[model samples]
Target: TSWRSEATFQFTVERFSRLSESVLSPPCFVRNLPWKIMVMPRFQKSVGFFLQCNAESDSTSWSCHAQAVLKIINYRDDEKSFSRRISHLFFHKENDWGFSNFMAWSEVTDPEKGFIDDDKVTFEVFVQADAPHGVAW
Candidate 1:
């Protein structure tokens, strides 16, 4: 058995040049579980991206086996817009995953490339899960 879910993070920066730090997207849910996206609008050399699993009210010990992709919504080049497939465990103790150098600054900051047009940028994340199956006795 398997399931898939997608979440989008959009931000409208008045001026891309003014971005000096990081931006985080609001929490989104999948299968009743919460997650968030993080982006470094102006990191040192490249863009920093991360996906974090939000804390649950139950706080019980649980984990899920999943894979995900981070995509730049408006990037002109398909090869540059998406990240490599990331397979990981969304564990209770460690709930974060992603890339430090997700994309290059030149690619994202170019005005004519479609990555940051009109000072707005968007990203989408898709998470897929595969349920473990067992044989009945």
Candidate 2:
């Protein structure tokens, strides 16, 4: 089996909407490598979600094969949680990828959906990276 890991993050829709900045989840590790979820507001009026491999390359070039599932939690019903699946090759020069519009502002921020609650939204991540490549501490 490959290295598998999971992490969850919550953001205040109002705060991010006002601050207009990116938020990163505390690092989750697999094989001692750091993986994080980066969520940014103020993009296409939609929230942007991505996964970053926070490891520098051993040299000029390196890569890791990863398959991840990014989910926007359903506060009222976890069973109906929405998510996306992605396969990527991560490297130092290009180490991040995911849904540019993970959840649209109108839908995720509105009162109509259960995804947003208490002015906050939650996200869940599940990922697998094959053993290792050319990454350095």
Which parts of model 2 have CA positions greater than 4 angstroms off?
1-19, 42-44, 55-61
Question: Whose TM-score is greatest here?
Answer: 2
For candidate 2, the 10 contiguous residues with the lowest summed lDDT are 1-10
Per-residue lDDT tens digits for candidate 2, residues 1-137, read: 11344444343334543536778776777655778878886564888888888644455456777888888888888887789999998888778999888878777777667887666777777887776666543
Q: After superposition, how far is residue 84 of candidate 2 from its true place, in Å?
A: 0.4
lDDT per model, in order?
Answer: 0.64, 0.72
Model 2: residue 135 alpha-carbon error in angstroms:
3.0
Clashes of each: 0, 0
Candidate 1 lDDT by residue in tens digits, 6-80: 544443444664567777677676644666777775344677777776444445466656678777767566564
